[PDB]
Amino acid sequence: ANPRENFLKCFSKHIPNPKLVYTQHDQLYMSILNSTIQNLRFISDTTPKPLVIVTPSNNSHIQATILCSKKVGLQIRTRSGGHDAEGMSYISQVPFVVVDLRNMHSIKIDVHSQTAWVEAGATLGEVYYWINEKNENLSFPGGYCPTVGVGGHFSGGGYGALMRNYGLAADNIIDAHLVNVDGKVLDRKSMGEDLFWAIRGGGGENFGIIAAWKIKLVAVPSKSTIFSVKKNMEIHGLVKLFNKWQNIAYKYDKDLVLMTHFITKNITTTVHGYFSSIFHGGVDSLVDLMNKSFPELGIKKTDCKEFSWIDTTIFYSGVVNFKKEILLDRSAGKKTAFSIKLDYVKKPIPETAMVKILEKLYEEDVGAGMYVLYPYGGIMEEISESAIPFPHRAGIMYELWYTASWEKQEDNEKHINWVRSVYNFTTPYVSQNPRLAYLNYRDLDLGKTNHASPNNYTQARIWGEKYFGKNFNRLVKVKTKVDPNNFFRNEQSIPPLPPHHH
Ligand SMILES: *Cc1cc2c(nc3c(=O)[nH]c(=O)nc-3n2C[C@H](O)[C@H](O)[C@H](O)COP(=O)(O)OP(=O)(O)OC[C@H]2O[C@@H](n3cnc4c(N)ncnc43)[C@H](O)[C@@H]2O)c(*)c1C
Ligand SMILES: *[C@@H]1O[C@H](CO)[C@@H](O)[C@H](O)[C@H]1NC(C)=O
Ligand SMILES: *[C@@H]1O[C@H](CO)[C@@H](O)[C@H](O)[C@H]1NC(C)=O
Ligand SMILES: *[C@@H]1O[C@H](CO)[C@@H](O)[C@H](O)[C@H]1NC(C)=O
């Protein structure tokens, strides 16, 4: 009796006769494993590999895997788009199998009722595309990156351009299909409201394997206006603009998103701020708005085109500059090694301190580090904190991402340490009790939950409280109820409650 072969037998038993199981012996193993590992940082020979990969195409397949891993004693890591910031969807410390959902990417739109059934392995890109094909004036609220998978994205909250208008993708989910620790398939009805609440932004990896979402589509203007302007002046003049942006961006009506980037340019060199818009409306209203609200930014008509939504979608994603069918292409953009961390901001950062933050970009190579800033007003002020597990709503001015991408496996420690040091540095200026963070940018630095350690609950709280709010209690309530033996677990997952505290 050994687990790989015992698994495979059990699986065959539950399901006789495409390929659904891969082992190291299969020619395709490696390139499947590899295909969707998004962060090159976790591609080494040292990196643990699973005993089996399964690629289900049917709820029945998922039930079997869950059942068989339960029996033989393997751990599951589900991979949907593979974008985990920490590789947590494809690495484990213990013998494990990855459940790659790439074969379950069906997307079924009901144009009239304005809903859609999207399977767990589809990618934003696809969702965007196929919605737009059915109707140019429709879409869905979600991240910017087309290759993000909907399993990780939605169950983690997930948001982007439409955030200020409609909220997080998790805010717009009507139903789902989920398989639990007992291998049952559950709709919302049968799931019950606690579990339906939980999977919407509490991390699906804590409760089960989601198989499908039901999605409610949102209205989207047939023309939006985009400018995106370069600003490489002297460092102080730059922050003078930043400070202004900081106090107003979140204040616009719902129809303006104004975001900002920072990086270094000129290879051997100066800090550059880019300021970008999605404006639901025309060129002139927009210039007028800008000319009124933010003169010093000095945008002009010459500065901005008006695009269709899907074009805007494209403009604002990881692909150079063409045609809209890239949205469909699993292997677009370039994969890099990356480290990212994100802060939320409630109170304007002091101009002095900000130069210092910007000053730090000089300490890595040109283009390596980058700060992304997105504003936080509009609808987020009216959505309750416990509406869903994701609790970051009212009184946030904007969010700050600090990110580094590189190529080379040696330069790892160097680069992740930079990201940390900027994080450490900004600590006085960002949110505070507690320092809020975002489940979809997992940060093991916030604390780890170990395989080889007894499960202290008050330990998990430290980070549980950062990712979620007051929401954390209800979350551990749901865990304890639906997966009391903590079968669905990872290096930073919600623990159940031990039974003497039941
Ligand atoms: C790589 C990348 C990520 C981005 C980018 N832009 C984002 C943005 O603009 N807004 C955001 O809110 N998030 C952005 N993200 C990050 C993604 O939101 C997160 O990285 C998601 O968690 C990624 O989801 P996914 O693409 O599926 O990657 P996986 O590694 O497979 O991570 C999934 C995560 O959750 C578990 N899981 C996935 N699917 C399921 C199902 N069906 N059931 C249970 N659990 C599931 C996995 O185990 C893993 O833990 C821009 C870029 C470039
Ligand atoms: C795994 O990924 C790395 C970089 O993408 C690459 O060197 C290697 O060829 C990949 N594995 C394959 C093709 O089996
Ligand atoms: C899921 O379960 C079985 C196994 O193949 C099949 O009868 C059913 O139609 C499947 N549904 C799909 C592939 O949509
Ligand atoms: C979408 O919106 C515009 C703005 O009113 C309208 O003129 C256009 O005809 C619409 N088309 C569809 C297919 O909904």
Ligand SMILES: *[C@@H]1O[C@H](CO)[C@@H](O)[C@H](O)[C@H]1NC(C)=O
């Ligand atoms: C911006 O405002 C000034 C008036 O102070 C004006 O001269 C300029 O033409 C305005 N912009 C547009 C687009 O008209």
Ligand SMILES: *[C@@H]1O[C@H](CO)[C@@H](O)[C@H](O)[C@H]1NC(C)=O
């Ligand atoms: C960041 O802060 C933590 C906690 O105080 C510390 O352990 C770590 O070394 C710091 N990282 C730096 C200074 O880069």
Ligand SMILES: *[C@@H]1O[C@H](CO)[C@@H](O)[C@H](O)[C@H]1NC(C)=O
């Ligand atoms: C959880 O609580 C205990 C008991 O008071 C504490 O001492 C310990 O540090 C925590 N447990 C673990 C495993 O870290």
